[PDB]
Each structure stands twice: as C-alpha cells, then as structure tokens.
Design an enzyme around this catalytic site. Sequence first.
Site, PDB file in Angstrom:
ATOM      1  N   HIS A  87       0.821  -1.208   0.000  1.00  0.00           N
ATOM      2  CA  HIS A  87       0.000   0.000   0.000  1.00  0.00           C
ATOM      3  C   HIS A  87       0.857   1.261   0.000  1.00  0.00           C
ATOM      4  O   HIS A  87       2.042   1.270   0.364  1.00  0.00           O
ATOM      5  CB  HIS A  87      -0.971  -0.018   1.177  1.00  0.00           C
ATOM      6  CG  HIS A  87      -2.024  -1.060   1.081  1.00  0.00           C
ATOM      7  ND1 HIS A  87      -2.766  -1.452   2.173  1.00  0.00           N
ATOM      8  CD2 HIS A  87      -2.531  -1.716   0.017  1.00  0.00           C
ATOM      9  CE1 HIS A  87      -3.702  -2.301   1.794  1.00  0.00           C
ATOM     10  NE2 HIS A  87      -3.581  -2.492   0.486  1.00  0.00           N
ATOM     11  N   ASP A  89       0.993   3.836   1.888  1.00  0.00           N
ATOM     12  CA  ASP A  89       1.599   4.240   3.140  1.00  0.00           C
ATOM     13  C   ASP A  89       2.890   3.472   3.457  1.00  0.00           C
ATOM     14  O   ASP A  89       3.524   3.808   4.472  1.00  0.00           O
ATOM     15  CB  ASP A  89       0.604   4.199   4.305  1.00  0.00           C
ATOM     16  CG  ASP A  89       0.000   2.816   4.585  1.00  0.00           C
ATOM     17  OD1 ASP A  89      -0.329   2.123   3.623  1.00  0.00           O
ATOM     18  OD2 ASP A  89      -0.259   2.523   5.808  1.00  0.00           O
ATOM     19  N   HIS A 150      -3.799  -7.777   7.651  1.00  0.00           N
ATOM     20  CA  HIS A 150      -4.190  -6.547   6.980  1.00  0.00           C
ATOM     21  C   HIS A 150      -4.085  -6.652   5.475  1.00  0.00           C
ATOM     22  O   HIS A 150      -4.909  -6.082   4.742  1.00  0.00           O
ATOM     23  CB  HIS A 150      -3.331  -5.395   7.515  1.00  0.00           C
ATOM     24  CG  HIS A 150      -3.455  -4.132   6.726  1.00  0.00           C
ATOM     25  ND1 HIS A 150      -4.497  -3.235   6.867  1.00  0.00           N
ATOM     26  CD2 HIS A 150      -2.686  -3.671   5.740  1.00  0.00           C
ATOM     27  CE1 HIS A 150      -4.324  -2.264   5.946  1.00  0.00           C
ATOM     28  NE2 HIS A 150      -3.204  -2.483   5.265  1.00  0.00           N
ATOM     29  N   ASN A 181      -8.311   0.169   7.613  1.00  0.00           N
ATOM     30  CA  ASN A 181      -8.707  -0.011   6.226  1.00  0.00           C
ATOM     31  C   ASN A 181      -8.555  -1.503   5.893  1.00  0.00           C
ATOM     32  O   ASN A 181      -7.434  -1.997   5.773  1.00  0.00           O
ATOM     33  CB  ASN A 181      -7.903   0.867   5.301  1.00  0.00           C
ATOM     34  CG  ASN A 181      -8.510   0.930   3.973  1.00  0.00           C
ATOM     35  OD1 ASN A 181      -9.180  -0.026   3.493  1.00  0.00           O
ATOM     36  ND2 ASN A 181      -8.358   2.065   3.303  1.00  0.00           N
TER      37      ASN A 181
END
Length: 232
Positions: A87, A89, A150, A181
């Site tokens: 991702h 981030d 995740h 998320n």
Amino acid sequence: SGEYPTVNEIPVGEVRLYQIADGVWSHIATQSFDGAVYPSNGLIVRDGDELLLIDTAWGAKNTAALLAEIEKQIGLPVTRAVSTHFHDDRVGGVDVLRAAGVATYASPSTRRLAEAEGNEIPTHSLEGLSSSGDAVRFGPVELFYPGAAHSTDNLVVYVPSANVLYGGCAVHELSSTSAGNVADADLAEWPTSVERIQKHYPEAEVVIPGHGLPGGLDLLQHTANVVKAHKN
Ligand SMILES: C[C@@H](c1cccc2c(-c3ccc(NS(C)(=O)=O)c(C#N)c3)c(C(=O)O)[nH]c12)N1C[C@]2(C[C@@H](CN)C2)OC1=O
Ligand SMILES: [Zn+2]
Ligand SMILES: [Zn+2]
C-alpha cells in the site's frame, strides 16, 4: 514536546521522529486519502554508521521531508529501506528513496501487488519470506512473515537489540475500535497471523502499530479482538 505525535499535531507534509530505544526511532507523517487525514508510522534502525528505514512516509513529498528530518535529527545516511506491504503508506515514496540513492527492498509478493495496483515498486526482492512463520535477517532487524492479515503480503519487523516489535498495519493501536482499512485484508486469517507473532516474539517490550501509538504486547491481543469483532 515529548508525547507520541498524533494526527492533528502533524500537518500533511511534515515528518516527526520519536525515539523508541537506543538506535531505534519511529517516523510519523500524515496524509489525505479519500478526503480524510490519517497518521502513519515507520521505523528507523541504526545499522553502524548507516540507517535502515522501514516504510516510506506515505507519499513522495512526505518521504523527501522524512529524509530531511533524518538528516537534521540523526545525521547518518539511509542506505536501505524495506517496505512491509504494497500500500501507498508503505511504498509511496520509494521513487524518492531510489533517487536519493537508497536501495529499496520488499518481498516478491509485495512487489507483484504494488506493480499490479500501480503503486511504487521497491527494487530488490526479499526471498525466504513466502511461507507463514518464515524469518530472515536484514541488517539490525529480523523480518517475519506472519501470514495474511491486513494484507496478504504484510511483514513484521523485530529489532532484537532492543526488543522492539514493529507490527506494521497487521497491528493496531490500543485506542482503535475498528480494524482500520480492511479493503485488502483477510479477517478470517488475521487472528491466526497475530497468534504467530505472539508466539514468535514473546519478549517484545515495545509494539509499534502501522498507524497510531506504540505500546506493549497488549496491542497484539487487542488487534485480534478488534478484527474478530469486525468480522462478526
Ligand atoms: C493507503 C492505505 C490506507 C488509506 C487510508 C486509511 C488507512 C488505514 C487506517 C484507517 C483507519 C484508521 N483509524 S480510524 C478508523 O479513522 O479512526 C487508521 C488509523 N490510525 C488507519 C490503514 C490501515 O488500517 O493500515 N491504511 C489506510 N490503504 C488504501 C487501501 C488500498 C485500497 C484501495 N485499493 C484501500 O487500503 C489501505 O490500507
Ligand atoms: Zn495497508
Ligand atoms: Zn496501513
């Protein structure tokens, strides 16, 4: 002034560092996504007279600001970086790193996912991490693949000199009510992946989530609890 910095305390674009232990810092930045502002963490670990970076600061300009903050506060060169999942981030800013001469690394799984989804792609593949429970050494840390949580590719990082466990986005902060998320998550496997972390790192003293405040080992159980309840 000493407390861990929080989302409304960090304008987007600025980066702060937080000393976790001798030779271990977290980095904290903020970014907008889908019209809301979020904090996120990464890690910096001293590697002799060089630094190992874990995760970008969530975006190109944030990551340039991270490099500048490291030069101001620490003054040792970042030579290598590891991204702990695909991702933005974690990898957004890898192009900045690579043009700053940082060698960027991620698992092959992360690299494939980043490429398929149009995120920035670390240069070097980290083999030896494709089965849950796998661990490899990388400078002053151990990288561990706990299984899907995740994301399917998420890695955790342990600093054995300091007993610091950097959970990344597989681990949530204690104040969290929701599981963050979950777009790419495996809610069914997540608790089993956390239990692998708990088993492998029973002497962790500090646990750092991907977003929010560090704490102790309770972050792991809390994460398992919130994910199970979300799934319910
Ligand atoms: C880039 C990344 C992403 C963006 C925005 C927010 C988050 C969060 C998140 C959400 C809520 C949080 N707190 S809260 C309930 O508001 O109080 C906190 C905290 N602290 C953290 C996480 C995480 O949980 O790790 N990650 C995020 N992306 C984007 C995306 C890929 C997919 C699109 N294809 C969606 O998935 C993902 O993770
Ligand atoms: Zn994520
Ligand atoms: Zn995240």
